[PDB]
Amino acid sequence: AKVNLYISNDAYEKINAIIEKRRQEGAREKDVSFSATASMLLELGLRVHEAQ
Amino acid sequence: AKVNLYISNDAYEKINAIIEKRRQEGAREKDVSFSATASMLLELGLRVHEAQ
Amino acid sequence: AKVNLYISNDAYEKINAIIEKRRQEGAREKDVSFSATASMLLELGLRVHE
Amino acid sequence: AKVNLYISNDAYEKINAIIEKRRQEGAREKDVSFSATASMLLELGLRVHEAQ
Amino acid sequence: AKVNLYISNDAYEKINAIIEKRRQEGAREKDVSFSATASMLLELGLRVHE
Amino acid sequence: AKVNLYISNDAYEKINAIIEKRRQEGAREKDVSFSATASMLLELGLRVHEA
Amino acid sequence: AKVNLYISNDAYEKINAIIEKRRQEGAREKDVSFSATASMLLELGLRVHE
Amino acid sequence: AKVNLYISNDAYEKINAIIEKRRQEGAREKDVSFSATASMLLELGLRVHEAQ
DNA sequence: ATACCGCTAGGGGCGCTGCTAGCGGTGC
DNA sequence: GCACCGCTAGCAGCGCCCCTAGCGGTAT
């Protein structure tokens, strides 16, 4: 599902900060895309939302 | 920051499920947009990512 | 083309008056936007000007 | 009342075409602005909308 | 040559409408694919363009 | 509607040949895209198919 | 990973026999493909091998 | 019967891992091919599928 | 038989771009 | 008032990519 998010500059830089760590530890190039890692954080926030 | 996310159909429906709850409890129409609530979940996942 | 118009309060209320009629007769919500109906009136005034 | 209109490129050029005629016949510079002439055409379209 | 086309919903449904006719008259399954029939219509439009 | 077409090399080159003419006569860059001109030819073939 | 297997005619027919059962119980067409169900049986044989 | 399978990278590496063990214990070269050992695992999975 | 190479045929990711729409700010 | 700029919000075009699925060929 294609989705447009309008996030803060802080959140944007923090996501890029993660990807640069992944690509430094690993990683398969273009496997750790922006859409992937950000969607990974979204679903992560979803499972927490159900907890509380 | 304009951002394109490509999420699962499950995640998409769950986000909409939240908005329908918000608009039923509250809410100011168009204040609880998709981009807002999803970005809210993203930043929520970000603060958790740091905890580990 | 994004355009800024500075119109009278009368014209503004009359345009809103139209939209409220459209949304009462029809209409598809957000299909009869302010920008749309006002641009519709502009082009209407253009064809008359010719 | 400040208003945002999103018009066609044809309509945009035609309005400018008018202003260039006005400023060539007359005119007081900045008196025949874009906002003015376009609002003049809007109200013109309004009075026609009623007659029908 | 692999090609991405972004067509209207009308055109999309009309192409499917054709395939459902072909598979009802004939047809060899998967022989009348979407890519085939649509490419057939493209080349058809090409010869007309000339 | 996103669609994958697998066309001949002849058809592919002919479509590009058209775009190069458009961009030489006109044209607004990226307005005469591949997807656009090819979809224009598809719908053109559709209206003929009905006739 | 694209892989070529050269299996017995018995194994081939048995795999097809499964798919025909799946498509009769369910199923989403083309979701229960040959490659899928056969790869499902391969991984099944892998976990047993361990 | 010639057959195309599209398997996971994990499954692919595990099959190769087996062949490297066979060729180290034994084996007749090219007798323990990829197609053979993988088909051996398939039929193995088939006999299990019937048992349950 | 084995393992490689093509090829249509679909599908979706990915990141950029465009757009309409309404909100605001800036400096003249 | 004027004409630019910015921002969310949502939609989709655009062309690339990788993937599956199944079909064929090929030379060891």
C1'-nearest nucleotide to the CA of H6: J20
Q: Chain A within 8 Å of B17 (Cβ-Cβ)?
A: no
Query: Determination technique for this PDB entry?
Result: X-ray
- Residues in chain C, total: 50
Burial of H48 (0-12, 13-18, 19+ CB in 10 A): middle
B7 with A39: Cβ contact below 8 A: yes
- The residue behind tokens 């168009």 is B30
Which amino acid is residue D38, in one-letter code?
A
> How many Å apart are CA B44 and CA A38, to the nearest integer?
11
**Which residues have CB under 8 Å from B38's CB, separation 6+?**
A3, A5, A42, B5, B15
For residue A26, give how far its alpha carbon lies from the nearest alpha carbon of chain B (Å): 18
Spatial distance from the CA of F9 to the C1' of I17 (Å): 28
- The residue behind tokens 């055109």 is E11
Subunit partners of chain D (3 or more CB pairs within 8 A): C
> How many Å apart are CA A12 and CA A16, to the nearest integer?
6
> Which chain H residues have a beta carbon less than 8 Å from that of G40?
45
G36 — phi, psi (to 5°)? -70, -55
| Residues E48/F45, Cβ–Cβ less than 8 Å | yes
| Residues E43/F48, Cβ–Cβ less than 8 Å | no
Resolution (A): 3.1
H43 with G11: Cβ contact below 8 A: yes
CB-closest option in C8, C12, C42 to D38: C42
> How many Å apart are CA C42 and CA H27, to the nearest integer?
85
* Chains C and E lie in contact, requiring 3 or more CB pairs less than 8 Å apart: no
| Residues H15/H34, Cβ–Cβ less than 8 Å | yes
- Nearest CA to A38 out of B19, B46, B37, B10 is that of B46
| Residues H22/H32, Cβ–Cβ less than 8 Å | yes
B41 with A38: Cβ contact below 8 A: no
> How many Å apart are CA G38 and CA H4, to the nearest integer?
10
Q: Torsion angle of alpha carbons F21, F24, F26, F32, nearest 10°?
A: 50
> How many Å apart are CA H18 and CA H27, to the nearest integer?
12
Angle between helices B9-25 and B34-51 (to 10 degrees): 110
Cis peptide before D27 (omega within 30 of 0): yes
**Which residues have CB under 8 Å from H13's CB, separation 6+?**
none
Q: Which residues pair with G3 in a beta bridge?
A: H5
How does DSSP assign B1-52, residue by residue? -EEEEE--HHHHHHHHHHHHHHHHH---TTTS-HHHHHHHHHHHHHHHHHH-
Sketch out chain E's domains with CATH numbers.
Answer: 1-50 (1.10.10.450)
C-alpha angle B33/B37/B42, rounded to 5°?
140
Tell whether the torsion through CA atoms of E18, E22, E24 and E25 is positive or negative. Answer: positive
Angle between helices D34-51 and D9-25 (to 10 degrees): 110
**Which residues have CB under 8 Å from D50's CB, separation 6+?**
none
> How many Å apart are CA B1 and CA A38, to the nearest integer?
13
